[PDB]
Design a binder for these strands. Sequence first.
RNA 1: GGAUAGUGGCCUACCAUGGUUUCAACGGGUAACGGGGAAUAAGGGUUCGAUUCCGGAGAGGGAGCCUGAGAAACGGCUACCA
RNA 2: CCAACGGGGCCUUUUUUACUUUGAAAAAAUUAGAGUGUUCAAAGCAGGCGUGCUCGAAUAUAUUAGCAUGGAAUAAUAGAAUAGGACGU
Lengths: 141, 144, 260, 129
Amino acid sequence: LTVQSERAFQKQPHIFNNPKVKTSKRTKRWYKNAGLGFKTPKTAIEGSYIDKKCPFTGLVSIRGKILTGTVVSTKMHRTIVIRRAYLHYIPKYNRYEKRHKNVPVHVSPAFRVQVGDIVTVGQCRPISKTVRFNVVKVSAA
Amino acid sequence: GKGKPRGLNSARKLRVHRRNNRWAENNYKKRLLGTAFKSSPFGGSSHAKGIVLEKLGIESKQPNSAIRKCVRVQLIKNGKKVTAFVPNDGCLNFVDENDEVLLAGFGRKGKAKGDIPGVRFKVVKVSGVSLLALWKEKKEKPRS
Amino acid sequence: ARGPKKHLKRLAAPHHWLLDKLSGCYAPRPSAGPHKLRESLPLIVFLRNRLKYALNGREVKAILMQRHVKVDGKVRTDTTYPAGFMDVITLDATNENFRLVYDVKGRFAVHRITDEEASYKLGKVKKVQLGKKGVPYVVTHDGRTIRYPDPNIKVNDTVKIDLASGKITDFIKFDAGKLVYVTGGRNLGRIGTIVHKERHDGGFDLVHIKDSLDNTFVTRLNNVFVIGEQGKPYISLPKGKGIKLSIAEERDRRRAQQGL
Amino acid sequence: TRSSVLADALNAINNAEKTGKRQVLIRPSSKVIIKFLQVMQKHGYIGEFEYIDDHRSGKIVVQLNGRLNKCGVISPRFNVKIGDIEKWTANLLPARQFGYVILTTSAGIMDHEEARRKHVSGKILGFVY
RNA sequence: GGAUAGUGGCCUACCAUGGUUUCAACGGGUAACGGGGAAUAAGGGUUCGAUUCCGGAGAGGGAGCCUGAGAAACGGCUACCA
RNA sequence: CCAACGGGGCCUUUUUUACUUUGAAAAAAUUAGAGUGUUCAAAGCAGGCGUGCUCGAAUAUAUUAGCAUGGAAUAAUAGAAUAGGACGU
């Protein structure tokens, strides 16, 4: 996709590439590993997208709960909704009932995600009125 | 068998079913609708005070034969109008119009008691003194 | 509330102080200081309720204002100064020294020590970091900051501190086979040796402890305090050596032996 | 629409026992049925039994000796904690000192007394006395 | 980008068309402050909790603000309504 | 010695959940409960012994959700078929 689609120039902050030197190589790119055993995917190291909310190339960090669910909607830009299902115990009747929750979560351009995938998400700081979690691993069902 | 679900995950239907059927219980429905506030003369209290309007005799239901002694009362807090029974025979001489009386329920939770048609309440005190004390000649009543 | 709170109702006080229910409406609120409120011991509670040297809160103040009491070698006069674990208290008249340490029931004991041992205290290392101008420092559990530690000192180690000067003189590494003292949770006051440690990244590490009767138990690493090598404490231990007994054993010992 | 193969089997045994027959045939079999019968056999409530192969879930013939009062299944298979076992025995068994409640546990299928010795729990299957 | 002690449609400009729901959304009622707890119990339950401890809100009704580490304070101030 | 009941090792071709055990957690008062002749009791947390010495202020319970751990019956879920599979040394 076109990287420079916005009205402002997109770049990683404080990453300076110096025209005085003019090495015949890739533009400099910064990345990190999120920890807890999640591997940084190669599309992040070698891609060209700019996304300040990405867990491997943005200014976000992952700490707290880690959750799983199934993808239910992909219609927003860079965000998805997952469904989480569980059983609730009612003591008087000694039996269970089904319930569910919807969680909206941010997804990085490093991942390709489709309805019905199973996804693992990690907690981050508030990044919108509703979003609190970031996609960190994908399994293609 | 037995016409109700048994399955281990059927808890939602069981509790919803019970909620629907409790509305046939007579006293349950009274609480949840708040009937005692919206209607009935004592707005849910055990006693009420009123002003005596006039004095009445009520013919008993057949097969009994008696003219029983009652009064019309207007409740101070509502203005609602009510008929009350006066116990203990000659005690009717102790009550007169524009006296102030304390009333109690006639024991049957809003039903009429015994011979007496449509009378739900009895007098307890008049002008601040109890009828039981007057009848046994233990106190005296000032006029006004 | 529109700001900090100044009062502490009784019943809300920590249970290990052993205040009675009916003597009043309020309890002494500890001042801000080296130790957390929930786990400190105010001086008024020590002098009045434990030692019985004072009958009233009024009398306690008459003692402190004469400067008879010093904590870690310094005179203190605040009635609600928060003493805490491992502190040294000195009363110069009467010529007595105490170290605050736990009973196996989880209460602060009255433990007397010699005039020699009163020279020093132990401290658990809470963090190590570089300060301004690149000078390294350590922080102990009682909030001291000590310049220029030995490069080998790491978090969860224990450090021996001279109360005069305040310098470090020795240290013990956290390792298997060390003696530990348990300072929180259900097992407060027990003593044993480290068997091994469980790593849980992003969570709480757990430590397996064995005591001299070879009972075993588990606690969060936060509650563990290293105090010496196997069989060689760096401090005098309180009576009963941190051995937990069942209620049946306790009943026998009292009435059979002491109950004669 | 057989919802429970185990429920049918114990129902057949009850009806035979009441009328005084000495043998009964049940169809189909399953692993769970075999395990359940072996427990009943150990404590002496039934004789030997024999399995017939047919490439189609098989059949069983059971010998009956007249000692059985009742057997039955509990449905659903409620979860049971170790503290709860004492309540089920009070409701189901006729006395404090004979009869058995039968459980599935990850240690196997067993009666409620063996489960106390081994200190395990799981889910309830049924009862015998 | 602005503002804030600081995150965030918290607010502004431009852009996209999304978000919740028969597993009960949204709307209506409560003579509804939440909890530790209380009464009556074979077991399973039913009813209550303004009130000695913990948390929240308010100072006739609404709005605004000064001082200060901390207040949208009422035994502080300013205006309107009664 | 011997009998029963529990448990470990070895030989014999040798993906994802529910559920259950154990542990840490769940303020004090209240509740159940140990000690102690408030003159008895409801209470309280005290009090004994010679006439300075000394024992105490236990213990249990606390659904569900979250955390760590042992089990693998029962009930689900996944895998090699236009092989595009495994080992490939």
